[PDB]
Design a protein around this ligand. Sequence first.
Ligand SMILES: OC[C@H]1O[C@H](O[C@H]2[C@H](O)[C@@H](O)[C@H](OCCCCCCC3CCCCC3)O[C@@H]2CO)[C@H](O)[C@@H](O)[C@@H]1O
Ligand SMILES: *C(=O)/C=C/N[C@@H](C(=O)O)[C@](C)(COC(=O)CCCC(=O)O)S(=O)O
Length: 258
Amino acid sequence: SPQPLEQIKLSESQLSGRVGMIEMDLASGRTLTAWRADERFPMMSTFKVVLCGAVLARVDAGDEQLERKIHYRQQDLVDYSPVSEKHLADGMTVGELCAAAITMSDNSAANLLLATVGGPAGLTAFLRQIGDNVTRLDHALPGDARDTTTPASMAATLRKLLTSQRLSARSQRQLLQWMVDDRVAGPLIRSVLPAGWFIADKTGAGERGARGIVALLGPNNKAERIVVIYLRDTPASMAERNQQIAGIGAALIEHWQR
Ligand SMILES: OC[C@H]1O[C@H](O[C@H]2[C@H](O)[C@@H](O)[C@H](OCCCCCCC3CCCCC3)O[C@@H]2CO)[C@H](O)[C@@H](O)[C@@H]1O
Ligand SMILES: *C(=O)/C=C/N[C@@H](C(=O)O)[C@](C)(COC(=O)CCCC(=O)O)S(=O)O
């Protein structure tokens, strides 16, 4: 593979789309690679990690419990509810809702959780409170800033949730574990990663070719770096979008020591 930046450029050329990317040391926030890092991209399902960060902040504050059982009705379900559709009789705990939202991208779970943090306005206020003045949730054509972030903002926000003292030790540990447990792409990624490489992640997909991943990655079985990659405005097949992101991954892996 070529160098990371060379591969990012090749991916834009092949996809006819915009790629946005940050590679960041998790412990320190050192930025290693930045490409369109201040440009806006649709977050898609990647917002679910930030959502559950806000849920954990309420738990830490004494205003929520991960144990608390939420009962919901079939009429409350929205499109794509692979876990939540199974619990109409018995409900789900707030913690289970977060696990379903992050690890399965369960939309009904995310919707229920979003209500608890005061909707999109409430989540946006949470972001402003932790110093993210860029990311916004309002609920995919160009010029629409709704439900968007930048690679730099998302990376900084994820770092703050995972490592700063904004969340309790236990809550940091929980948020990381939900990402380790991703079922959408985690096992697939492991299957193609060389031995010794740690992965935790949340994926996203959307209209007009939108595709993305927020991940922790590193050799020696350590979450050494945050990697955020967003694609937008490409007509490419999902398989091709996946392959291009994987290719950027390969360039990082082959050329890690920078
Ligand atoms: O340094 C040489 C390494 O190169 C290859 O590994 C290949 C691997 O066989 C391939 O499957 C992967 O594809 C990349 C798959 C990445 C999966 C997605 C990555 C995500 C994670 C972070 C956020 C965005 C991308 O590339 C690497 C590097 O060439 C060899 O197989 C391996 O033995 C060796 O250790
Ligand atoms: C989050 O990114 C959601 C993406 N797409 C869903 C949606 O728009 O609600 C779909 C229902 C597809 O969902 C999936 O394939 C699950 C995995 C999505 C993910 O990568 O998180 S819609 O058909 O696009």
